[PDB]
Design a protein around this nucleic acid. Sequence first.
DNA 1: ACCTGTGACAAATTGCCCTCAGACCCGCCTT
DNA 2: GTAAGGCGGGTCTGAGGGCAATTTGTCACAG
Length: 214
Amino acid sequence: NSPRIVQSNDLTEAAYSLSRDQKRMLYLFVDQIRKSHDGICEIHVAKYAEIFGLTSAEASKDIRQALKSFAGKEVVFYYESFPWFIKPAHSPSRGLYSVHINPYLIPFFILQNRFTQFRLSETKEITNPYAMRLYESLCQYRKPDGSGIVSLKIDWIIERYQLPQSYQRMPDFRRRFLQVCVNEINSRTPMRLSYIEKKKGRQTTHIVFSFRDI
DNA sequence: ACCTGTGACAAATTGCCCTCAGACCCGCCTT
DNA sequence: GTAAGGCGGGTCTGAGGGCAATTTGTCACAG
Ligand SMILES: [Mg+2]
Ligand SMILES: [Mg+2]
Ligand SMILES: [Mg+2]
Ligand SMILES: [Mg+2]
Ligand SMILES: [Mg+2]
């Protein structure tokens, strides 16, 4: 009976760079917003700890540092850029944080034909944020029986997930992004994932993912 | 030229550990 | 002896300060 996150495909496919801790918080904002609004959300240290199996101390550390690092981050919807926050976060009470999400993001969070959905228990053990991005993109194509198949273009992966510059060399892309993230998904989610490479000449251009549910 | 994979090293991140003051509660002293 | 109402101290939290072991980001070399 875990909380069911649903979100517009525009967010699944947006270009941005967030840490694991920031994305964990972002799922709860999207849930809060969705039960309704004006963008103001809230996070309690003690429930976050319980949700993600952390101590109170380490939850506090994760929230605090995540919140400070939102400053200056933008989100781009394909070409329109917005800041996530329009005011700094603050604590009215011990164990409580209050946050001001950009009100212009609300429509981008929630069209009834174009959406992505997963239960939070599916992603809360993933560590690498890129494996988080990848698992959201695959869910976007999932069927009721839990299977799907999709071809993603490599340049689009690099742009939207904002992979670091040295992964433009394909052997580094293979070793440090693709193999690690397919292993995490196979190990940390109920999804079972395989893939093959599409070539054009000597260049590899797309990755084709197939998956089913356990 | 282009392509691949591997070995090295640096920078970042993980779950831990400790300390100490804030909020909350309630047994006991006082009247 | 009882009973009602305030206070000091004890427990529960979370806001800080750290750590070493692993993972991620980068580039030389060779095939
Ligand atoms: Mg990072
Ligand atoms: Mg942490
Ligand atoms: Mg060529
Ligand atoms: Mg060598
Ligand atoms: Mg050569």
